[PDB]
C-alpha cells in the first residue's frame, strides 16, 4: 500500500513519524552509529543498517584524488545503504574547517583566528557559501563546522580554531552557518534544524561547551568556572546558532567543574534540548564516550550507558562498531535504557535527513565537480587573507619613514625565511593531513611566488631561506621581506607552554634586518613572544595562517589595498601573565584587543 515516508510532498514531521514506526531495534541503533570510511564495506553498511560515515583528518580515497574520485567513493557507500529494506540514506561528514581542507586542490581559506581580525561577518558568510559548494563538489553533505569555542588561553593547541577571546566577536561570526546551510525562512522557529538544498550542507556547532576555557589551555582537560561565567562567556554563541538553524551540535571532550561533557545530562538534555529547544541531533566527538572513563575505553559498557542517557543522539564510534551495537542492544533488552530515549535519538537524526532533502537526492551531482578550487573562491580567499593581516609596527621610531607600503619597482630586493616559500606552513593544521604538512602539499601561491607576481619586471628578486649577515650587507638590496613563524599543528600537539617560534627564526630576522630595512611577516596560529622580533624589524605584520592564496599578503604589502585588520586576541608581554583577557584586573598587554595600525592604497 501507500508508504507515507517515501512521499516527498508530505510534511517532515509526518514522514519521520511514519518511518520511525516501521523500524526494528537493529535498524534504530543502526541510525545512531557513525563509522570511519576505513572500516566500511558494502556488506557492513547493509547488514548493520549504518546511518552515517565520516573521514577523519587525512582519511582520503587516494593522495591527489580528484573531485570525481571522491564522488564515486561516496556514491558507492550510499548504494549499499539504499539497498536495505527501508532504504534510509546515510549522511557523510568531514572536517571542512577552512575550505574543503582534506581535498587536494580545494581552496584553503584563512583559519578562524585570522577571520576574527577582519571583523567582517558578511565576508565569513560568503566563505561559508563557497565552502558548501566545494564540499558538495566531492559528494559530501555534512561539515563539522563551525567551531565556536572562545579560546581564553593561547597555550591551547586549538586556539587558532577560535575566532576570538571576546565572545561578542564569536557570536557575530556565526554567520558562517547560514552561508553553509542557507538562510532560514521568516517563519523560522529558533532551534529547528535547517538546510536549503543540494548545494548546501548540514553544519555543526562545536564543541559543547566551554572547550576554549580549560585550565592552562590544556586540550580536553577541565574547565573550572562558575555557572554564571559559563553562561555569559562560553554559552552565548550557541543561542545564536539556534536562531540560525544549525543542524547538529558536537559534544566536547572537556569537563565542566569535574563533570565530563559526554556524560552531563544537565547541560545536554536539560539545557541544550529542553531550554534552548534544540531539535537537530547531538553527536559525540571521536571516541568521546571512551574517554569518559580513565583510562579511556576501560569500561565501554558504562560509556555507552552514561552518554546515551546523558542525551547524545549519534555516536562517532568510529571503528569498533560491533562492540558499540552489541553493548547498546544489551542495555535496551535489559531495560537499562528506555525505548523512548532511542526513539528520541532516531527521530532527531531522521528529522535532519528528511529536512535537507537526503531521501530525494541521495547521490552526488557530477556537475558540481567543477566547483572544487574555482577562481572565484580563490579570489574570495585572497580578499580574506588580506583583510586578516594586522600591522603591528611600521617604522622603528616615530620619526622614521614608513616602510609600508613598499614600492613595486626597485633595483634588487631580498625575500628570506623558512615561511617565505612553504605552502604547508602557510596553511597550518587541518590541511591535507590531520596535523598539516610541509612543502607544496596542494595547489596555491607562496609568499615568494606572490612577490614575483607583483613586482615590476625590472625588479630583481633574490631568494635565500637562511642568509648570513654579510651576504645581506654586500648584496646591495633596497629592502627585504622575511617570513617566519610556527610550524603546523593540530589539537594536543599544539599545546605549548613556552609560546616562542622555532629556530631558525629569530636569528634569520636579526641577520637580515641588521643589514637592510626589513618587513617581517609573522605566520602563527596565535600570539607568541614577539619582543625580540619587534626590536629588530622596521615593520612587522601578523598574518596568522593565511591559507592557499599568498597574494593576499602582498596585496597589502605593496599598497594595492590598505591595512584594516585588528587584533582579535590580547597580545601578552610574557607567558606568566596567562591567562589574561580583556576585563581582568591584571590586564597589562603588549598590544590590546582591537589594536592595529593602518595605511592607504598605492605603493
Ligand atoms: C616550546 O614548546 C614546544 C611544544 O612543547 C616545543 O616543540 C615541540 O618539541 C618537541 C620536542 O620534545 C617536538 O617533538 C619531536 O619532534 C621531532 C620532529 O619534529 C619535526 O616534525 C614535526 C611534525 O612531525 C613538526 O611539528 C616539528 O616542528 C618539527 O619540524 C621540523 O623542525 C625542524 C627544526 O625546527 C625544521 O628544520 C624542519 O624543517 C621541520 N620539518 C617539518 C616536518 O616541519 C621528532 O623527530 C621527535 O621524535 C619528537 O617527537 C615537537 O615536534 C615540537 N612541536 C612542534 C609542533 O614544534 C618547543 O621545542 C623547541 O622546538 C623543537 C622543534 C626543538 O628544536 C626543541 O629543541 C626546541 O626546544 C619548545 N621551545 C622552547 C622555547 O623550549
Ligand atoms: O574528525 C572528527 C572530529 O575529530 C576530533 S580529533 C580526531 C581526528 O579526526 C583523527 O584524525 C585522529 O586519529 O584522532 C583525533 C582524536 O582526538 C576533533 O576533536 C573534532 O573537532 C572533529 O570534528
Ligand atoms: C588534565 O591534565 C592533567 C595533566 O597531566 C591530567 O593529570 C589530568 O588527569 C587531566 N584532567 C582532566 C580534566 O582531563
XYZ file of C-alpha atoms and ligand atoms in Angstrom:
714
model
C 0.000 0.000 0.000
C 0.875 3.709 0.238
C 4.155 4.446 2.050
C 3.915 7.910 3.622
C 7.636 8.366 4.431
C 8.577 7.991 0.755
C 6.185 10.774 -0.313
C 8.306 13.880 -0.884
C 5.195 16.077 -0.726
C 4.319 15.281 2.905
C 5.472 17.443 5.829
C 8.738 16.423 7.523
C 7.353 15.518 10.968
C 4.859 13.124 9.360
C 7.485 11.308 7.302
C 9.636 10.943 10.414
C 6.737 9.513 12.438
C 5.700 7.112 9.681
C 9.228 5.792 9.197
C 10.114 5.512 12.885
C 7.056 3.340 13.437
C 8.242 0.724 10.940
C 11.765 0.298 12.323
C 13.167 -2.622 14.340
C 15.613 -2.163 17.238
C 18.517 -3.154 14.983
C 17.589 -0.528 12.397
C 17.190 2.214 15.028
C 20.557 1.547 16.654
C 21.995 1.453 13.136
C 20.951 5.079 12.595
C 22.779 6.107 15.790
C 26.088 4.669 14.560
C 28.739 6.620 12.620
C 31.837 4.759 11.396
C 35.109 5.728 9.685
C 35.328 5.010 5.949
C 38.440 2.929 6.676
C 36.310 0.197 8.283
C 33.363 0.464 5.883
C 32.241 -2.177 3.380
C 29.037 -2.515 1.349
C 28.230 -5.592 3.458
C 28.924 -3.849 6.775
C 26.679 -0.912 5.890
C 23.915 -3.212 4.709
C 23.970 -5.847 7.456
C 24.289 -3.277 10.267
C 21.933 -0.596 8.904
C 24.621 2.084 9.400
C 23.347 5.656 9.465
C 26.482 7.722 8.904
C 30.116 7.701 7.788
C 32.987 10.170 8.091
C 36.577 10.792 7.075
C 38.840 11.738 9.968
C 41.729 14.091 9.247
C 43.774 12.722 6.346
C 41.367 9.846 5.602
C 41.235 10.111 1.793
C 40.471 7.687 -1.079
C 43.940 8.351 -2.606
C 46.619 11.008 -2.428
C 45.801 13.547 -5.135
C 42.327 12.072 -5.704
C 40.119 14.203 -7.960
C 36.684 15.519 -7.009
C 35.109 12.759 -9.093
C 37.041 10.031 -7.266
C 35.507 11.382 -4.029
C 32.040 11.370 -5.611
C 32.420 7.760 -6.743
C 33.556 6.674 -3.281
C 30.618 8.361 -1.513
C 28.097 7.009 -4.048
C 29.486 3.507 -3.653
C 28.713 3.597 0.071
C 25.308 5.232 -0.484
C 24.403 2.455 -2.928
C 24.741 -0.128 -0.160
C 22.692 1.887 2.316
C 19.878 2.427 -0.193
C 19.724 -1.334 -0.776
C 18.481 -2.000 2.760
C 14.873 -2.967 3.492
C 13.848 0.592 4.431
C 16.284 2.351 2.099
C 17.443 5.002 4.559
C 20.283 7.039 3.001
C 23.443 7.673 5.000
C 24.934 11.097 5.710
C 28.680 11.595 5.133
C 30.586 14.006 7.366
C 34.028 15.606 7.195
C 36.072 18.398 8.764
C 35.850 21.277 6.283
C 37.053 23.915 8.766
C 38.736 26.423 6.393
C 37.624 25.213 2.988
C 37.279 21.526 1.996
C 40.755 21.148 3.528
C 41.237 17.353 3.276
C 40.976 17.546 -0.519
C 43.815 18.140 -2.964
C 43.173 21.280 -4.994
C 40.454 22.687 -2.733
C 40.544 26.405 -1.882
C 42.141 26.899 1.547
C 40.751 29.880 3.478
C 42.479 31.535 6.465
C 41.908 29.822 9.825
C 39.309 31.325 12.201
C 41.631 33.440 14.355
C 42.511 35.403 11.231
C 38.869 35.710 10.190
C 38.147 37.324 13.547
C 40.701 40.022 12.779
C 38.569 41.078 9.776
C 35.504 41.935 11.903
C 33.530 41.260 8.715
C 30.584 38.875 9.253
C 29.397 39.207 5.648
C 32.777 38.031 4.371
C 32.570 34.944 6.596
C 29.062 34.222 5.312
C 30.410 34.241 1.753
C 33.214 31.870 2.752
C 30.505 29.584 4.115
C 28.668 29.602 0.773
C 31.878 28.840 -1.141
C 32.845 26.093 1.329
C 29.473 24.369 0.901
C 29.865 24.293 -2.888
C 33.357 22.807 -2.580
C 32.193 20.174 -0.107
C 29.298 19.217 -2.396
C 31.820 19.052 -5.245
C 33.157 15.902 -3.579
C 29.740 14.387 -2.868
C 29.820 15.120 0.872
C 26.775 16.633 2.634
C 27.847 17.324 6.226
C 30.597 19.607 7.601
C 31.928 19.515 11.176
C 31.984 23.336 11.398
C 31.973 25.967 12.814
C 33.995 25.611 15.994
C 32.516 28.402 18.121
C 34.868 27.902 21.055
C 36.016 31.010 22.910
C 39.750 30.452 23.411
C 40.744 32.074 26.704
C 44.354 30.912 26.828
C 46.598 30.932 23.707
C 48.590 27.991 25.068
C 45.751 25.772 23.822
C 46.587 23.840 20.659
C 43.220 24.706 19.103
C 43.155 28.427 19.824
C 43.530 29.127 16.093
C 40.179 27.405 15.507
C 38.637 30.119 17.688
C 37.517 33.449 16.245
C 38.406 35.448 19.366
C 38.798 35.663 23.150
C 35.800 38.046 23.105
C 32.516 36.132 22.805
C 30.907 39.126 21.096
C 33.045 38.609 18.001
C 32.465 34.849 18.067
C 28.698 35.477 18.095
C 28.816 37.730 15.044
C 30.903 35.128 13.222
C 28.095 32.551 13.439
C 27.058 33.983 10.064
C 29.087 31.076 8.677
C 26.121 28.832 9.443
C 23.557 30.484 7.115
C 26.307 30.525 4.493
C 26.847 26.760 4.780
C 23.164 25.829 5.180
C 21.305 28.714 3.537
C 19.194 31.462 5.118
C 16.295 30.421 7.354
C 12.698 31.353 6.349
C 10.787 34.192 8.021
C 8.516 31.667 9.732
C 11.593 30.061 11.297
C 11.469 28.743 14.866
C 14.742 29.035 16.813
C 16.161 25.579 17.489
C 14.846 23.818 14.383
C 17.410 22.217 12.031
C 17.646 23.642 8.503
C 19.375 23.047 5.155
C 18.158 24.708 1.941
C 19.037 22.060 -0.610
C 21.533 20.056 -2.626
C 24.105 22.831 -2.964
C 24.208 23.393 0.796
C 25.416 21.190 3.650
C 24.388 20.472 7.239
C 26.561 22.387 9.712
C 27.794 21.566 13.214
C 28.451 23.919 16.136
C 31.276 22.559 18.300
C 32.331 21.770 20.924
C 29.539 21.947 23.542
C 30.537 23.579 25.830
C 33.405 25.620 27.259
C 36.079 23.845 25.214
C 38.175 27.007 24.954
C 38.261 27.627 28.693
C 40.293 24.728 30.071
C 42.947 25.172 32.774
C 46.280 26.400 31.373
C 44.812 25.763 27.934
C 45.330 22.018 28.285
C 43.434 20.284 25.463
C 40.473 18.127 26.544
C 41.085 18.964 30.223
C 38.917 20.644 32.888
C 37.088 23.978 32.610
C 36.888 25.402 36.144
C 34.380 28.255 36.285
C 31.007 29.059 37.854
C 27.709 28.594 36.018
C 27.198 32.328 35.536
C 30.611 32.706 33.902
C 29.919 29.656 31.764
C 26.645 31.230 30.673
C 27.965 34.674 29.681
C 31.267 33.671 28.071
C 31.053 30.168 26.574
C 27.300 29.702 26.011
C 26.079 32.852 24.145
C 27.221 31.791 20.650
C 25.162 28.588 20.907
C 21.940 30.548 21.253
C 22.823 32.448 18.072
C 23.469 29.148 16.297
C 19.947 28.075 17.314
C 18.373 31.180 15.744
C 20.171 30.329 12.508
C 19.003 26.710 12.400
C 22.315 24.929 12.989
C 21.504 21.270 12.133
C 23.733 19.448 14.649
C 25.896 20.040 17.745
C 29.041 18.115 18.733
C 29.928 17.482 22.405
C 33.369 18.425 23.777
C 35.954 16.054 25.305
C 36.447 18.570 28.123
C 34.762 18.594 31.532
C 32.969 21.350 33.423
C 33.914 21.551 37.099
C 34.898 17.892 37.067
C 31.937 16.560 35.080
C 32.632 15.068 31.624
C 30.541 16.855 28.978
C 29.894 13.495 27.264
C 28.054 12.370 30.415
C 26.492 15.653 31.526
C 22.723 15.253 31.329
C 22.060 18.624 32.989
C 23.619 20.580 30.125
C 22.997 18.249 27.167
C 19.344 17.327 27.773
C 18.376 19.838 30.446
C 19.785 22.962 28.832
C 20.523 22.318 25.146
C 17.404 20.281 24.348
C 14.821 21.358 26.941
C 15.756 25.022 27.412
C 17.247 26.083 24.067
C 14.737 23.832 22.293
C 17.370 22.285 20.022
C 15.600 19.951 17.572
C 18.532 18.691 15.492
C 20.708 15.802 16.638
C 23.617 15.720 19.080
C 26.799 13.918 18.047
C 29.813 12.890 20.124
C 33.446 13.616 19.308
C 35.963 11.000 18.091
C 35.923 8.222 20.726
C 34.346 10.756 23.045
C 32.456 8.261 25.178
C 35.557 6.057 25.574
C 37.307 8.964 27.299
C 34.511 9.343 29.855
C 36.457 6.883 31.982
C 40.110 6.704 32.946
C 41.901 5.040 31.457
C 39.865 5.590 28.282
C 37.816 2.677 26.984
C 38.311 0.748 30.235
C 34.562 0.330 30.853
C 32.858 0.689 27.479
C 29.575 -0.687 28.839
C 29.412 2.255 31.240
C 30.486 4.695 28.497
C 27.529 3.697 26.302
C 25.067 3.815 29.195
C 26.229 7.200 30.502
C 26.473 9.026 27.164
C 23.170 7.771 25.745
C 21.300 8.543 28.984
C 23.049 11.921 29.116
C 21.311 12.688 25.831
C 23.643 12.066 22.882
C 21.958 11.039 19.616
C 24.669 9.846 17.231
C 27.936 8.224 18.254
C 31.184 8.744 16.322
C 32.493 5.313 17.383
C 34.295 5.304 14.931
C 35.971 1.913 14.383
C 34.722 -0.732 16.805
C 31.075 -0.612 15.708
C 30.347 -4.256 16.585
C 31.034 -3.666 20.274
C 29.025 -0.438 20.334
C 25.958 -2.010 18.702
C 26.180 -5.180 20.814
C 26.502 -3.307 24.111
C 23.763 -0.797 23.279
C 21.389 -3.592 22.236
C 22.095 -5.398 25.504
C 21.186 -2.333 27.578
C 17.872 -1.871 25.779
C 16.891 -5.552 26.010
C 17.782 -5.401 29.699
C 15.656 -2.313 30.278
C 18.635 -0.238 31.438
C 17.924 2.289 28.665
C 14.279 3.010 27.735
C 12.985 2.740 24.170
C 11.775 6.343 24.371
C 15.395 7.596 24.554
C 16.277 5.538 21.471
C 13.170 6.794 19.647
C 14.126 10.378 20.544
C 17.626 9.992 19.062
C 16.414 8.379 15.834
C 13.660 10.996 15.487
C 16.252 13.769 15.575
C 18.591 12.042 13.121
C 15.759 11.391 10.656
C 14.388 14.939 11.014
C 17.711 16.331 9.762
C 17.964 13.866 6.862
C 14.403 14.486 5.673
C 14.786 18.264 6.012
C 17.944 18.516 3.913
C 16.320 16.518 1.114
C 18.519 13.436 1.522
C 15.746 10.983 0.629
C 15.061 12.877 -2.605
C 18.728 13.423 -3.556
C 20.869 10.660 -2.042
C 23.611 10.716 -4.698
C 26.272 13.169 -5.839
C 25.901 15.645 -8.673
C 28.653 15.053 -11.249
C 28.181 18.639 -12.450
C 29.294 20.054 -9.082
C 32.836 18.710 -9.575
C 33.946 21.907 -11.356
C 33.302 23.841 -8.133
C 36.448 22.468 -6.494
C 39.025 25.242 -6.241
C 37.384 27.598 -8.752
C 38.981 31.017 -9.253
C 36.061 32.977 -7.773
C 36.618 31.101 -4.491
C 40.372 31.740 -4.588
C 39.700 35.460 -5.151
C 37.493 35.336 -2.043
C 40.234 33.622 -0.007
C 42.677 36.246 -1.260
C 40.360 39.008 -0.032
C 40.018 37.244 3.336
C 43.747 36.774 3.846
C 44.404 40.453 3.082
C 41.726 41.702 5.500
C 43.059 39.408 8.255
C 46.545 40.959 8.333
C 47.287 43.089 11.395
C 50.017 45.733 11.089
C 51.770 45.968 14.473
C 54.685 48.269 13.650
C 55.624 50.447 10.682
C 58.944 52.222 11.292
C 61.463 51.693 14.108
C 60.942 55.110 15.679
C 58.093 57.610 15.457
C 60.330 59.851 13.334
C 61.283 57.089 10.880
C 59.815 56.970 7.386
C 57.028 54.379 6.994
C 58.402 51.230 5.324
C 54.978 50.037 4.134
C 53.657 50.232 1.540
C 56.733 49.094 -0.386
C 57.459 50.202 -3.975
C 56.950 47.592 -6.727
C 59.939 48.975 -8.619
C 63.414 48.710 -7.078
C 66.850 47.614 -8.353
C 67.029 44.471 -6.226
C 65.145 43.024 -3.236
C 65.501 40.082 -0.842
C 62.893 37.505 0.201
C 64.008 35.293 3.096
C 62.833 32.935 5.791
C 61.576 29.432 6.462
C 57.978 30.502 5.725
C 58.612 32.504 2.554
C 58.260 29.545 0.189
C 56.393 26.778 2.026
C 52.695 26.342 1.211
C 52.195 23.846 4.035
C 53.477 26.180 6.757
C 51.317 28.928 5.253
C 48.181 26.773 5.735
C 48.847 25.330 9.198
C 46.932 22.391 10.679
C 43.874 20.644 9.195
C 45.262 20.859 5.657
C 45.524 17.698 3.521
C 46.822 15.805 6.553
C 45.351 15.988 10.067
C 48.379 17.781 11.551
C 49.093 19.641 8.325
C 52.384 19.227 6.468
C 55.469 20.882 4.956
C 56.160 21.906 1.357
C 53.862 22.053 -1.658
C 51.048 19.809 -0.392
C 48.271 21.264 -2.565
C 47.533 23.977 -5.164
C 48.333 27.547 -4.126
C 50.668 30.545 -4.135
C 53.511 31.006 -1.637
C 54.690 34.410 -0.400
C 57.751 34.193 -2.670
C 55.612 33.421 -5.712
C 53.246 36.233 -4.727
C 56.074 38.788 -4.605
C 57.457 37.768 -8.004
C 53.953 38.054 -9.431
C 53.567 41.575 -8.035
C 56.807 43.431 -8.753
C 57.887 45.423 -11.785
C 59.691 43.308 -14.427
C 62.882 45.318 -13.878
C 62.977 44.411 -10.185
C 65.479 41.654 -9.380
C 64.141 39.199 -6.798
C 66.639 37.105 -4.852
C 65.588 34.275 -2.532
C 67.591 32.878 0.389
C 65.987 30.759 3.112
C 68.582 31.449 5.821
C 71.204 34.022 4.723
C 74.076 35.097 6.965
C 74.703 38.725 7.915
C 77.409 39.550 5.376
C 75.502 38.042 2.476
C 72.872 40.684 3.182
C 75.206 43.652 3.683
C 77.089 43.027 0.447
C 74.021 42.162 -1.624
C 73.015 45.733 -2.416
C 69.302 45.216 -1.679
C 66.776 48.067 -1.350
C 64.764 46.152 1.239
C 63.840 42.659 2.350
C 60.712 40.685 3.214
C 61.250 37.971 5.843
C 58.682 35.331 6.762
C 58.959 33.148 9.867
C 56.650 31.568 12.443
C 55.094 28.452 13.955
C 55.025 25.034 12.315
C 51.754 23.217 11.533
C 49.950 21.607 14.465
C 46.519 20.347 15.490
C 44.826 19.661 18.827
C 47.067 18.382 21.649
C 50.284 18.514 19.625
C 49.520 22.222 19.655
C 49.562 22.629 23.434
C 52.585 24.824 24.085
C 53.775 26.337 27.362
C 56.661 28.491 26.078
C 54.982 30.075 23.008
C 58.213 31.010 21.205
C 58.765 30.475 17.474
C 61.179 27.694 16.389
C 64.646 28.312 15.003
C 65.967 29.389 12.737
C 63.533 32.259 13.016
C 64.751 34.993 15.322
C 68.293 34.553 14.028
C 67.171 34.959 10.404
C 65.272 38.140 11.245
C 68.297 39.513 13.089
C 70.766 38.593 10.347
C 68.608 40.178 7.633
C 67.298 43.252 9.448
C 70.785 44.009 10.705
C 71.841 44.540 7.111
C 68.862 46.275 5.489
C 65.423 47.717 6.246
C 63.091 44.772 6.651
C 59.377 43.990 6.719
C 58.757 40.924 8.892
C 55.737 38.701 8.195
C 54.779 36.559 11.203
C 52.910 33.340 10.408
C 51.268 31.806 13.504
C 48.056 30.417 14.955
C 48.147 32.737 17.959
C 50.150 35.499 19.666
C 53.708 34.426 20.551
C 56.671 36.009 22.383
C 57.319 38.857 19.962
C 59.555 41.495 21.605
C 62.834 40.293 20.026
C 61.232 40.220 16.574
C 59.684 43.623 17.210
C 63.016 45.191 18.233
C 64.870 44.029 15.123
C 62.387 44.928 12.378
C 61.287 48.181 10.788
C 57.817 46.760 10.145
C 56.058 43.674 11.487
C 52.833 42.147 10.219
C 50.727 39.476 11.914
C 49.385 37.252 9.110
C 48.178 34.317 11.235
C 47.601 31.265 8.956
C 46.505 32.845 5.593
C 45.837 29.659 3.622
C 46.472 28.873 -0.045
C 46.253 32.371 -1.572
C 49.538 34.054 -0.750
C 48.747 37.069 -2.918
C 46.538 38.270 -0.086
C 49.689 39.130 1.849
C 51.420 41.006 -0.991
C 48.276 42.942 -1.947
C 48.664 44.815 1.342
C 52.481 44.900 1.392
C 52.778 46.675 -1.959
C 49.924 49.089 -1.369
C 47.191 47.790 -3.667
C 44.954 47.892 -0.567
C 45.479 49.359 2.886
C 45.799 47.504 6.190
C 42.486 47.229 8.031
C 42.816 44.194 10.290
C 42.645 44.472 14.074
C 43.739 42.133 16.873
C 41.058 39.523 17.701
C 43.010 38.496 20.833
C 45.123 40.162 23.524
C 48.861 40.123 22.853
C 50.665 39.346 26.113
C 54.023 40.620 27.359
C 55.023 37.223 28.740
C 53.512 33.784 29.287
C 53.326 34.064 33.078
C 50.651 36.740 32.677
C 48.384 33.987 31.329
C 45.540 33.642 31.382
C 44.911 37.333 30.670
C 41.792 38.519 28.840
C 40.086 41.866 28.281
C 38.307 42.631 31.521
C 40.661 41.093 34.068
C 42.274 43.240 36.748
C 45.905 42.406 35.966
C 45.261 43.427 32.351
C 48.630 44.767 31.156
C 49.169 43.737 27.479
C 51.852 44.458 24.890
C 49.045 45.223 22.416
C 45.374 45.401 23.407
C 42.461 43.656 21.720
C 41.312 45.833 18.835
C 44.807 47.165 18.133
C 46.018 47.600 14.566
C 47.841 50.253 12.534
C 46.579 51.217 9.072
C 47.798 52.503 5.701
C 46.313 53.781 2.436
C 46.413 52.285 -1.080
C 49.120 52.803 -3.769
C 52.790 51.912 -3.080
C 58.161 25.087 23.147
O 57.195 24.035 23.285
C 57.004 23.292 22.059
C 55.879 22.310 22.313
O 56.102 21.573 23.506
C 58.313 22.603 21.637
O 58.134 21.978 20.348
C 57.969 20.599 20.306
O 59.190 19.983 20.749
C 59.114 18.541 20.729
C 60.354 18.010 21.419
O 60.021 17.377 22.647
C 58.954 18.057 19.286
O 58.899 16.615 19.245
C 59.855 15.985 18.460
O 59.532 16.225 17.081
C 60.502 15.646 16.174
C 60.126 16.075 14.763
O 59.716 17.457 14.769
C 59.529 17.975 13.481
O 58.356 17.458 12.837
C 57.103 17.847 13.451
C 55.993 17.160 12.683
O 56.045 15.750 12.859
C 56.971 19.372 13.458
O 55.763 19.755 14.099
C 58.168 19.976 14.198
O 58.089 21.394 14.176
C 59.482 19.512 13.547
O 59.600 20.070 12.221
C 60.883 20.253 11.724
O 61.585 21.134 12.621
C 62.945 21.394 12.202
C 63.614 22.212 13.296
O 62.950 23.449 13.501
C 62.946 22.096 10.841
O 64.281 22.328 10.417
C 62.217 21.219 9.815
O 62.132 21.909 8.575
C 60.808 20.871 10.317
N 60.164 19.960 9.386
C 58.850 19.758 9.440
C 58.367 18.316 9.426
O 58.032 20.676 9.509
C 60.518 14.122 16.332
O 61.519 13.567 15.487
C 60.799 13.745 17.793
O 60.654 12.341 17.959
C 59.843 14.481 18.747
O 58.523 13.977 18.595
C 57.663 18.644 18.706
O 57.565 18.303 17.331
C 57.642 20.174 18.860
N 56.333 20.685 18.498
C 56.193 21.480 17.440
C 54.941 21.300 16.595
O 57.028 22.334 17.129
C 59.451 23.632 21.538
O 60.702 22.947 21.327
C 61.625 23.608 20.504
O 61.450 23.309 19.114
C 61.757 21.945 18.734
C 61.488 21.823 17.245
C 63.209 21.609 19.091
O 64.090 22.417 18.320
C 63.449 21.858 20.585
O 64.818 21.634 20.891
C 63.064 23.296 20.953
O 63.179 23.476 22.357
C 59.536 24.485 22.813
N 60.519 25.537 22.632
C 61.193 26.007 23.677
C 61.316 27.516 23.803
O 61.700 25.275 24.529
O 37.457 14.288 12.639
C 36.281 14.186 13.504
C 36.468 15.039 14.796
O 37.780 14.668 15.266
C 38.240 15.040 16.632
S 40.026 14.816 16.759
C 40.324 13.190 15.996
C 40.876 13.220 14.362
O 39.866 13.479 13.290
C 41.508 11.817 13.862
O 42.057 12.017 12.536
C 42.623 11.280 14.892
O 43.107 9.920 14.556
O 42.026 11.255 16.267
C 41.537 12.528 16.875
C 41.209 12.130 18.383
O 41.283 13.247 19.295
C 38.083 16.674 16.858
O 38.116 16.972 18.220
C 36.740 17.250 16.208
O 36.838 18.670 16.184
C 36.471 16.645 14.701
O 35.320 17.179 14.158
C 44.200 17.308 32.994
O 45.577 17.204 32.592
C 46.435 16.668 33.625
C 47.858 16.729 33.093
O 48.591 15.554 33.418
C 45.987 15.250 33.996
O 46.800 14.739 35.046
C 44.531 15.282 34.447
O 44.081 13.963 34.706
C 43.652 15.920 33.374
N 42.291 16.020 33.869
C 41.278 16.222 33.031
C 40.171 17.152 33.498
O 41.213 15.696 31.917
